[PDB]
């Protein structure tokens, strides 16, 4: 039950992982979660605002 994942590499390879314990709080940190969604804190308006259009008309 081995997991093969990709390593952090430069721009312009794999590693193997096996879990030994039974609790899942014993596992290693999730360092490869690169999900973003800034539209909650930024631009949180009810009506959408187009960039080229005047904010108030």
């Amino acid at each position: 039950g081995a997991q093969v994942s990709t390593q952090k590499t430069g721009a312009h390879i794999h590693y193997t992982n096996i879990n030994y314990y039974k609790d899942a709080a014993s596992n290693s940190a999730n360092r490869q979660d690169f999900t973003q969604d800034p539209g909650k804190f930024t631009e949180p308006v009810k009506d959408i605002m187009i960039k080229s259009l005047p904010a108030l008309n």
Binding site: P44, V45, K46
Partner: protein
């Protein structure tokens, strides 16, 4: 053909119309709703007053002067003595609700000034005396606004609050309060400000007398200024509507 400046909001038996509005800020992109079956823990059937509780309540007005530091209101405390919202939180042990906050301030073109209206979650404040904690009377004003100070408060074995405006009572930079849902009342452009806040807590419901989930702060970043002969008395009015309010744990009225 219409104007994005004119907006009307209708809730229960109340309706607010503004001819000069920037827009509506919606919490964290989340419209308020009721608690779902797969997120609940308390097992009795909830009560939902709807039109009776979800409606606009208008509070006392404050006067914006040329030297005013700012005002704050704990949302649950602000409406704790108002109508059936107050009665329902008096007879119940658990409550849950969101808000629509509308701030109002009009003036003529000559009048200048800018206010920040911000809804801050868990606005835990600090006492002037380092060993002590701020008194409930000092932290909460149910029917009256709480005022900030400009000068620092003196610490002499008291239970006062460090109401310094440039620290926002929370010992943080006041200019960085923009992460929280907010809108700016700029007298030359704006007339009113509107925020729709959802229920924000680490628990599915909470007791509404010993915990204030959110605090409303109004802070003038640019002072109020007018030339002689213009109106000198300029008020600010706050109107708040609970949204999707539900209550559990019916028992004898009272908080102890």
């Amino acid at each position: 053909g219409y104007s994005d400046r004119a907006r009307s909001i209708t809730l229960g038996n109340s309706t607010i119309t503004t001819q000069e509005c920037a827009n509506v800020v919606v919490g964290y992109g989340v419209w308020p709703d009721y608690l779902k079956d797969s997120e609940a823990t308390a097992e009795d059937q909830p009560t939902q007053p709807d039109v009776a509780t979800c409606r606009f309540y208008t509070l006392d007005s404050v006067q914006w002067q040329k030297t005013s530091p700012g005002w704050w209101w704990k949302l649950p405390d602000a409406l704790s003595n108002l109508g059936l919202f107050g009665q329902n939180m008096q007879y119940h042990y658990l409550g849950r609700t969101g808000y629509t906050v509308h701030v109002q301030c009009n003036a003529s073109k000559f009048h200048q000034g800018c206010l920040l209206v911000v809804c801050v979650p868990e606005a835990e404040m600090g006492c002037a005396t380092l060993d002590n904690t701020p008194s409930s009377a000092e932290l909460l004003g149910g029917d009256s606004a709480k005022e900030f100070a400009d000068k620092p408060v003196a610490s002499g074995s008291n239970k006062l609050v460090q109401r310094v405006v440039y620290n926002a009572g929370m010992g943080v930079g006041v200019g960085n309060l923009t992460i929280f849902p907010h809108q700016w009342i700029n007298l030359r452009t704006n007339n009113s400000a509107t925020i729709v806040m959802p229920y924000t807590n680490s628990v599915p419901m909470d007791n509404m007398f010993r915990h204030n989930n959110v605090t409303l702060m109004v802070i003038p970043f640019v002072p109020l200024d007018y030339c002689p002969g213009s109106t000198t008395y300029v008020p600010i009015t706050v109107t708040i509507a609970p949204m999707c309010a539900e209550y559990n744990g019916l028992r004898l009225a009272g908080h102890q």
